[PDB]
Design a protein around this nucleic acid. Structure first.
Ligand SMILES: Cc1cn([C@H]2C[C@H](O)[C@@H](COP(=O)(O)OP(=O)(O)OP(=O)(O)O)O2)c(=O)[nH]c1=O
Ligand SMILES: [Mn+2]
Ligand code: NA
Ligand code: NA
Length: 327
DNA sequence: CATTAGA
DNA sequence: TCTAATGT
């Protein structure tokens, strides 16, 4: 956590660099387990060789340690840190829509800067077009004060649309978070459960409303279960307009909301921690259910959940407020 | 780790 | 059909 900081950290630099600038998934895989092990590593690495003992540590990575321990730096991370071609891939990739592959191609054609990106809006596709178009807004944080105005409206149409609908703004915002990056609407409905051969309009009806009133401004990807877009607060009685924010809404078969909800309400840790335990408590929890476990090694049999609570009791525990699901 | 665009 | 991207 701190005893092996740089090490894991340098490691990750190196790895991320292997995966992005270079399409060397293996080496990339090298650095991660490694960086993962030295990480569990309970003592101060004193040298290459010491580390070298561990699994995942070969000679190359060992080699890197020494030099890092020796000169408080690293040549390659130095060289790399400098290199535009790579500096560039590190950068372009920040536009929603540009992944590494594209990142590379762009550069190749010589598309290094944001401006480059504009002059070639032609080369870009819808996601990435909207991507660049809200480069600023998408990089900003969502003040909770705003989180609440948004939540306010979402719930309102959703409801005006059909009352039978259930919505939940999940994620950090749900867990108190002073700010949030993207908004997460978990959505389900009675009519939609595990079986009932869908009803796409369910997603659809809503997406539209939200657009009609003018909250949803753009579309990144609408699907029959996951619409994914951009929204904005009604720039008041002017002067201060609102930043465009990333919004996401997904339909859920009503018979899987709570787990689902438990889940997206995080955190990553409270989550695992809960999962790791449900296990002890003779169960299993995943993004959608809670099945009683059985001795042949594994079982099934999806227990019926009516609230975050049900899931709780099931593994027999104390309800944990969103506010306090920190870990 | 699944759901979407896209070519 | 694959294959990239986002998220989670
Ligand atoms: C898990 C935790 C959240 O459910 C989910 C991730 O949604 P994310 O948007 O990836 O994360 P978050 O909601 O915790 O963070 P924030 O809203 O501040 O961006 O997966
Ligand atoms: Mn979020
Ligand atoms: Na990107
Ligand atoms: Na392949």
């Amino acid at each position: 956590e701190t005893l092996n900081g740089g090490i894991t950290d340098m490691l990750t630099e190196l790895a991320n660099f292997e995966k992005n600038v270079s399409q060397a998934i293996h080496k990339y895989n090298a650095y991660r387990k490694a960086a993962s092990v030295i990480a569990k590593y309970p003592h101060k690495i004193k040298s290459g060789a010491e580390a070298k003992k561990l699994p995942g540590v070969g000679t190359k990575i060992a080699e890197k340690i020494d030099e890092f321990l020796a000169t408080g730096k690293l040549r390659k991370l130095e060289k790399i840190r400098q290199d535009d071609t790579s500096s560039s891939i590190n950068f372009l990739t920040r536009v929603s829509g540009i992944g590494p592959s594209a990142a590379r191609k762009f550069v190749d054609e010589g598309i290094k800067t944001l401006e480059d990106l504009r002059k070639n809006e032609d080369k870009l596709n819808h996601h990435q077009r909207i991507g660049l178009k809200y480069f600023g807004d998408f990089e900003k944080r969502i003040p909770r004060e705003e989180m609440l105005q948004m939540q306010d409206i979402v719930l309102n149409e959703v409801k005006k649309v059909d009352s039978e609908y259930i919505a939940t703004v999940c994620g950090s915002f749900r867990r108190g978070a002073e700010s949030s990056g993207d908004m997460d609407v978990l959505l389900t409905h009675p009519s939609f459960t595990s079986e009932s051969t869908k009803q796409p309009k369910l997603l659809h009806q809503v997406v539209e409303q939200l657009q009609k009133v003018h909250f949803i401004t753009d579309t990144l990807s609408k699907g029959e279960t996951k619409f994914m877009g951009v929204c904005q607060l009604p720039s008041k009685n002017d002067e201060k307009e609102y930043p465009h924010r990333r919004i996401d809404i997904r339909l859920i078969p009503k018979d899987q909301y709570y787990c689902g909800v438990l889940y997206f309400t995080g955190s990553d840790i409270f989550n695992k921690n809960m999962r790791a335990h449900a296990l002890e408590k003779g169960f299993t929890i995943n993004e959608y259910t809670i099945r009683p476990l059985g001795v042949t090694g594994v079982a099934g049999e999806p227990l019926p959940v009516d609230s975050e609570k049900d899931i709780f009791d099931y593994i027999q525990w104390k309800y944990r407020e969103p506010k306090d699901r920190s870990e």
